[PDB]
Amino acid sequence: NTINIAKNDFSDIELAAIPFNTLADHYGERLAREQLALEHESYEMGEARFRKMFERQLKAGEVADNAAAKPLITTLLPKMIARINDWFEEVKAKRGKRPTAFQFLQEIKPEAVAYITIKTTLACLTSADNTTVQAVASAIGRAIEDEARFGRIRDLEAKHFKKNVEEQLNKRVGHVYKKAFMQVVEADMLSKGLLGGEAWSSWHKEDSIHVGVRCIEMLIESTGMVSLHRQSETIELAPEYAEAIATRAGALAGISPMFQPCVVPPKPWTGITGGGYWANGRRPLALVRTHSKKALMRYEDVYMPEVYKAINIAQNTAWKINKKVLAVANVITKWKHCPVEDIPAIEREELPMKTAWKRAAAAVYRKDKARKSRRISLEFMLEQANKFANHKAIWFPYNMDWRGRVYAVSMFNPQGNDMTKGLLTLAKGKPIGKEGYYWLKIHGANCAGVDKVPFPERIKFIEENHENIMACAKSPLENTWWAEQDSPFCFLAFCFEYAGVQHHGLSYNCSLPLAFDGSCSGIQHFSAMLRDEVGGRAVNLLPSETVQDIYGIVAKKVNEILQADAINGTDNEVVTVTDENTGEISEKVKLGTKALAGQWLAYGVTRSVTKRSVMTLAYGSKEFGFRQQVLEDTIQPAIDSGKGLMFTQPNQAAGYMAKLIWESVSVTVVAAVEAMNWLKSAAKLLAAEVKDKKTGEILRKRCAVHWVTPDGFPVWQEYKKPIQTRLNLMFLGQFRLQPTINTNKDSEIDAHKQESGIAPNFVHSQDGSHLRKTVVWAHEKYGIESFALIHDSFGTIPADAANLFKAVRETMVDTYESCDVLADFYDQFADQLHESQLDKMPALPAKGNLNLRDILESDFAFA
DNA sequence: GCCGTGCGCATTCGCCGTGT
DNA sequence: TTTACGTTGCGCACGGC
RNA sequence: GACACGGCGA
């Protein structure tokens, strides 16, 4: 059959008159009404895309995949698996010849059969009308075969799968491709003969229908999901069931709004929910984006006045569309040949259709999927600024993720990519003045990518290009030099402001938002908390006449070691017995440091080889991780570019390099590395399930991790292991299932997830608190009211940048000067469960010699 | 008690969309 | 209804002469 | 507390 969805009544969201007078008088009916029209639209747009997506999935037999099918699919699956099992019993206890189907349904697991039956037939019915029990049965029988055949090369003697065939499967997409690919793997698993040598004996269409038939029957027997329409004959979906998916899908499409900016200041936050938008719609905003309610309730009665003042001041910043920039963006994006790098192609590419051509395809392919993806987004951010082009000002509601970071709620907001940032500017401008001008030029220098050199040099760079800049402002569609800069629209956006000053002088009212970005917040904060004077200089926390480059500092240290090895290290080998590689059974050319240190130097190791690795350090990236980055980022790309033969055995080459980067960075920034290991031990111990080694009883259960940021924001890290069992099918994807063991309730913490998350999560929560403090500081001590916020990037209008430049450094300083985050963290969990004698807990790492006051005179820290 | 096998894991969080 | 190159060790867990 | 594939922000 077909699922009939119906639209929702969003008119309800059109707030009452008493709450409406809250807006009117405040902002006036025109807007007050417009806003509510806007919020109502958000919900309609959301419903629009759900219905669309749905209809798409339906016309592809993927109904079972939709979140509307799930609630029902999960009620049936058990009833089916049970019937299948019961059946297998009757058929056994009954003397004589067993049904022709029994034998085949024995290959795959019962639960697999049940899902493939629910799913496959669930499609056939909603797709076409060939809902004939003979056609459906063949569909089921065919799917059951392929799962059985290509399933063994996974469940049966086949780990080679989770190695040489698992990841390569996730690449191919579509029931069709994955099959044409397994037929392939299958054929070559013979040259080696994994499953021994039992070549899958085809099934023969006859039986492949006795099976499909049995299943249908079992399905009908266990649950009236489908009904056999009396008549060759056909089947159709049970009404109560069809009307069910329609109901879930209806509700689902009303809690999926496509949030937009506000036309009036957003609604102040006074609680954990309800702030931001004014209507009291279906999806009320939550101050915090917690996973699974309950956590959001923890914030219910927490006293954190400063956190509130911040989220409010922040979303109270008025913005407007940048028309001049919108003017060029609208058109230059319709060009066949755009001067701006990687700004989609209105039209799709093509490939040269005549080892060789293999890539001539894989290339254009990848390249297009990615482009079609950027296009969808660009067009939306575009066909949306045009909608707010004329408004006097717009606003964006804010809330935070669970660590405290502040995210704007609307889909189109100031924290997007370059084209989005360029289209937006601040509404409340002010006469630029002598300094706003100074900073404006620096903002412009940074937009051109010239940011790795001192301030006078950045000013010179801009002064030097006066005429280029003047030209781009006069005729952006003609000159286009701005389009070749690192952030073209933001740069262009600065060109129009820079020209304004020329034409009008310093009394000129400017509102362009000048960004002050920190360099590696993670490392800046660890170094700052541990007083690391060496890692702190590397990230500009200390005054210098030169701008420090942590990546350059690391690459440099790599060559220091690259020399010491090229002529003073290991030599080749041919593999021995249980040496360093645990215990392999053969022998190759295990290259030695001197061999490796040779190829790298014979390559030219610069900052770009280390860039990637230092960036992800704060996300827990270690030596193994680097092996992946260097290989993918540096080698492969160079090997494929044909211009790199230093490497013969690249995997060995990367292990070494990855080892070197780890070493040096491990001495460059110790506070970071050190504070990270500490954080991980603490997490490791609280998540541990302590059982007495004697009685085997649990003395202390696994624990979650909690802490409060310096501005009073509490954070609870409690990753949890999957509730239900995850079963993955070869082609028909995965599906959950209730726990086989009743004595498996609770919830269960995920100790591994607690360890790999704590360090980055802790640091992020610190960055956030820093941002929040900075905002409140700036607003109270200096009176600034407009803020562009991107986690570790703070911005204002030129006339206000000197005071933000100040504020951002005074808060970093005041905060770390007023409290020890690590020792504070300890004092939180030490007592409150952790007991027994788990005291293998390392001592807080030692503080260094960094004098935080210096950060005040530091010019390149920004944050 | 203390290792040969054996195996689980590699980078965090927030978001949006899906050629035939 | 045809593109998907690339595969290495270190740790925390059982049982066991 | 969600497949995979692609894109973006820190």
Side-chain angles (χ1 to χ4, degrees), chain A residues 1-242 244-281 283-863:
Chain A
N1 295 51
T2 189
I3 302 165
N4 294 291
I5 308 83
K7 297 73 170 177
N8 301 59
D9 173 292
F10 295 130
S11 61
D12 70 273
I13 282 84
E14 307 284 39
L15 191 62
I18 299 300
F20 188 113
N21 194 60
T22 296
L23 279 192
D25 283 300
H26 226 179
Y27 306 121
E29 188 187 68
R30 187 234 298 166
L31 297 186
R33 191 169 304 282
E34 179 164 28
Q35 179 50 48
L36 304 190
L38 230 37
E39 302 189 12
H40 178 269
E41 180 166 349
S42 284
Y43 279 85
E44 310 204 306
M45 297 171 76
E47 179 167 65
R49 69 141 133 60
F50 183 94
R51 291 178 69 85
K52 182 170 182 180
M53 182 197 303
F54 188 113
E55 297 175 356
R56 181 181 57 186
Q57 292 189 297
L58 219 55
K59 308 305 174 298
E62 311 219 295
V63 202
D65 279 357
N66 188 279
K70 309 306 182 44
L72 136 154
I73 305 296
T74 57
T75 305
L76 313 181
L77 204 54
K79 315 234 289 180
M80 241 297 255
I81 301 164
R83 177 80 268 293
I84 307 299
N85 284 161
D86 286 43
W87 187 62
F88 285 140
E89 304 327 304
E90 4 265 67
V91 49
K92 279 166 183 160
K94 187 173 178 297
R95 197 74 64 248
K97 184 180 183 68
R98 291 170 171 173
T100 47
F102 183 87
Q103 174 183 53
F104 298 114
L105 287 175
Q106 235 66 192
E107 315 297 82
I108 17 63
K109 307 155 297 186
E111 43 274 305
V113 171
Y115 186 72
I116 285 166
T117 294
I118 309 182
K119 199 265 182 50
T120 284
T121 100
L122 197 57
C124 291
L125 270 52
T126 52
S127 298
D129 186 8
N130 195 177
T131 64
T132 71
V133 313
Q134 299 140 293
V136 174
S138 181
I140 297 114
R142 287 304 179 304
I144 290 58
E145 181 167 2
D146 288 77
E147 181 56 20
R149 175 180 175 187
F150 309 103
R152 61 181 176 181
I153 70 171
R154 181 247 307 193
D155 289 292
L156 174 56
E157 45 194 358
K159 190 53 55 286
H160 168 72
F161 171 81
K162 303 176 183 179
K163 193 174 183 295
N164 299 60
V165 199
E166 184 177 66
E167 205 168 299
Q168 311 64 46
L169 241 193
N170 305 330
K171 264 65 179 300
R172 330 282 156 156
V173 292
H175 307 294
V176 185
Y177 285 110
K178 296 182 179 296
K179 69 84 180 300
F181 172 75
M182 286 312 259
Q183 297 158 180
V184 170
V185 182
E186 177 178 51
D188 297 291
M189 293 273 253
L190 319 183
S191 310
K192 300 183 175 182
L194 187 60
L195 306 312
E198 295 186 356
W200 181 267
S201 301
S202 185
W203 267 22
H204 206 294
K205 56 177 181 179
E206 181 198 306
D207 311 315
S208 199
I209 294 166
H210 289 84
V211 176
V213 164
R214 186 77 288 277
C215 295
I216 308 292
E217 309 187 64
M218 303 192 86
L219 207 185
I220 301 33
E221 288 170 50
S222 63
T223 181
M225 189 179 113
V226 310
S227 177
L228 270 165
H229 191 305
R230 36 189 174 65
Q231 194 194 311
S232 304
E233 67 284 70
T234 68
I235 40 166
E236 41 70 23
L237 179 57
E240 289 93 84
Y241 288 120
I245 300 106
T247 286
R248 187 61 151 189
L252 251 42
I255 62 95
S256 177
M258 284 200 248
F259 296 125
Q260 321 181 76
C262 302
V263 286
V264 291
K267 185 184 168 191
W269 288 90
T270 57
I272 68 296
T273 69
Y277 293 113
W278 298 89
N280 295 77
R283 292 295 60 162
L285 258 307
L287 216 201
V288 188
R289 312 184 178 191
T290 60
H291 302 304
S292 292
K293 191 171 182 179
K294 301 157 291 308
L296 173 61
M297 288 304 127
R298 297 227 185 80
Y299 293 97
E300 192 69 298
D301 292 312
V302 55
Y303 191 58
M304 45 176 192
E306 289 302 322
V307 181
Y308 275 100
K309 288 202 291 187
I311 294 141
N312 282 158
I313 293 302
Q315 58 176 31
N316 213 51
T317 297
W319 294 73
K320 70 182 177 180
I321 298 61
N322 186 312
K323 282 178 165 181
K324 287 175 166 295
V325 175
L326 205 191
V328 28
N330 267 328
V331 327
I332 199 165
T333 60
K334 306 309 173 196
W335 289 13
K336 274 77 68 181
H337 247 304
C338 180
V340 184
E341 218 33 49
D342 289 295
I343 276 302
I346 14 290
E347 177 193 60
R348 77 181 191 182
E349 314 123 2
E350 69 178 74
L351 56 181
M353 326 75 82
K354 275 295 185 177
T355 295
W357 187 85
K358 54 82 181 294
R359 49 175 300 193
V364 307
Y365 267 124
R366 291 181 161 176
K367 303 247 284 178
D368 182 305
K369 170 184 302 306
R371 184 211 112 247
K372 192 153 62 280
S373 269
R374 298 202 227 289
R375 201 69 216 179
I376 292 300
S377 160
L378 176 154
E379 302 211 350
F380 177 87
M381 299 305 237
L382 215 307
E383 305 156 0
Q384 208 63 180
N386 286 296
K387 190 129 103 60
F388 297 105
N390 307 313
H391 290 63
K392 189 193 178 304
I394 56 165
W395 284 261
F396 307 96
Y398 287 97
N399 63 5
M400 32 206 301
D401 72 10
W402 68 274
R403 293 81 54 67
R405 278 187 164 185
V406 184
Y407 292 89
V409 175
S410 55
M411 293 181 55
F412 167 66
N413 62 254
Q415 321 168 300
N417 73 347
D418 184 61
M419 205 196 49
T420 278
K421 287 199 281 288
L423 275 15
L424 278 156
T425 189
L426 296 166
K428 277 50 177 175
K430 181 179 309 181
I432 193 168
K434 189 184 190 297
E435 296 78 6
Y437 188 47
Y438 173 74
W439 289 114
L440 168 63
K441 304 205 300 286
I442 286 116
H443 177 248
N446 298 342
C447 283
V450 179
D451 64 298
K452 288 137 292 192
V453 76
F455 292 152
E457 212 276 9
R458 307 190 203 187
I459 291 300
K460 199 76 170 201
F461 172 69
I462 293 299
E463 293 173 344
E464 271 179 50
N465 286 283
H466 179 79
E467 234 58 59
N468 272 305
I469 298 164
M470 289 316 304
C472 297
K474 178 174 171 285
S475 294
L477 298 183
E478 209 208 311
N479 304 61
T480 88
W481 167 73
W482 59 270
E484 311 160 9
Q485 309 312 303
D486 288 352
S487 325
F489 293 100
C490 280
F491 187 74
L492 176 73
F494 143 91
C495 284
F496 292 138
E497 294 310 292
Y498 174 92
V501 180
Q502 310 302 144
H503 291 39
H504 309 284
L506 311 174
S507 45
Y508 174 79
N509 191 86
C510 195
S511 64
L512 189 71
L514 314 183
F516 281 127
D517 190 64
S519 37
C520 279
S521 302
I523 297 79
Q524 276 186 152
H525 286 278
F526 282 135
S527 300
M529 49 180 90
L530 289 187
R531 298 307 136 85
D532 184 12
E533 171 164 344
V534 180
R537 190 156 190 296
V539 295
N540 296 298
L541 256 38
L542 295 173
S544 291
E545 290 164 344
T546 168
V547 178
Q548 313 310 314
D549 181 7
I550 183 164
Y551 319 129
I553 298 299
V554 175
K556 202 179 185 57
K557 202 169 289 51
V558 155
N559 295 276
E560 190 165 356
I561 303 165
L562 219 40
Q563 303 310 314
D565 285 0
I567 34 165
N568 193 54
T570 307
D571 279 288
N572 292 53
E573 185 172 355
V574 300
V575 177
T576 56
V577 184
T578 59
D579 188 54
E580 177 181 355
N581 301 56
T582 307
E584 293 181 57
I585 304 165
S586 69
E587 57 182 60
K588 68 184 188 304
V589 186
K590 181 182 176 177
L591 285 175
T593 76
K594 295 195 66 180
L596 287 338
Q599 309 170 52
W600 276 113
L601 296 172
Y603 171 86
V605 181
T606 69
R607 65 195 307 284
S608 48
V609 184
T610 73
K611 211 278 191 63
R612 179 82 296 179
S613 316
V614 185
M615 282 173 84
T616 65
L617 183 74
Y619 302 146
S621 189
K622 281 267 198 69
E623 219 179 318
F624 172 68
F626 301 161
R627 189 173 317 155
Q628 258 37 269
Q629 297 164 170
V630 170
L631 179 58
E632 282 127 59
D633 293 314
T634 296
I635 301 84
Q636 290 177 26
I639 273 52
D640 300 350
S641 193
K643 187 69 69 176
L645 290 74
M646 321 76 188
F647 323 114
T648 65
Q649 164 56 312
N651 297 289
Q652 218 152 190
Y656 177 65
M657 177 45 91
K659 181 181 300 302
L660 301 193
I661 299 163
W662 173 258
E663 180 182 4
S664 60
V665 81
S666 213
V667 311
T668 296
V669 291
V670 184
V673 181
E674 205 150 289
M676 291 202 265
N677 293 169
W678 189 81
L679 283 172
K680 303 173 71 295
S681 302
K684 183 176 193 75
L685 306 184
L686 289 149
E689 176 188 66
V690 51
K691 302 163 69 66
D692 183 346
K693 296 198 171 192
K694 303 280 190 176
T695 60
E697 93 165 297
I698 286 73
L699 299 162
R700 202 215 72 216
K701 297 182 183 300
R702 299 180 176 291
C703 287
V705 200
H706 156 265
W707 71 90
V708 188
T709 62
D711 82 320
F713 184 74
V715 173
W716 283 279
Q717 170 174 290
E718 45 158 37
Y719 289 91
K720 285 162 171 293
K721 258 282 112 295
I723 8 71
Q724 296 168 298
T725 310
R726 307 277 280 296
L727 286 58
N728 212 88
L729 293 182
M730 290 313 305
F731 317 117
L732 301 190
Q734 68 107 247
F735 62 114
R736 297 157 197 48
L737 224 166
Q738 291 308 318
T740 60
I741 297 298
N742 287 58
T743 314
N744 182 60
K745 207 291 107 300
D746 184 60
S747 177
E748 195 183 7
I749 290 298
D750 187 332
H752 180 283
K753 230 80 172 172
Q754 286 293 106
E755 255 172 289
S756 64
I758 187 74
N761 291 159
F762 184 79
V763 223
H764 280 350
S765 75
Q766 294 308 322
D767 103 55
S769 182
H770 172 44
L771 185 133
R772 292 193 299 283
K773 275 188 174 303
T774 304
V775 170
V776 173
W777 187 250
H779 183 59
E780 291 179 345
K781 310 311 165 195
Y782 304 108
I784 303 304
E785 6 173 69
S786 293
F787 304 89
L789 311 153
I790 317 82
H791 314 307
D792 57 318
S793 187
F794 315 73
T796 346
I797 66 165
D800 283 348
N803 289 322
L804 177 56
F805 179 94
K806 202 188 171 203
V808 69
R809 282 150 228 266
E810 318 194 311
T811 52
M812 187 83 172
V813 172
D814 230 282
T815 297
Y816 286 126
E817 205 108 291
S818 298
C819 54
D820 185 359
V821 289
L822 296 176
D824 260 348
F825 178 46
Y826 178 92
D827 274 62
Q828 200 90 202
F829 72 78
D831 183 68
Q832 291 138 55
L833 278 66
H834 177 276
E835 281 292 78
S836 286
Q837 222 333 69
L838 201 43
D839 282 63
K840 282 298 173 300
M841 176 79 243
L844 284 161
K847 284 63 179 173
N849 302 294
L850 174 70
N851 170 192
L852 292 182
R853 281 285 154 56
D854 293 8
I855 296 165
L856 292 178
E857 270 59 64
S858 166
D859 285 0
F860 311 117
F862 284 11

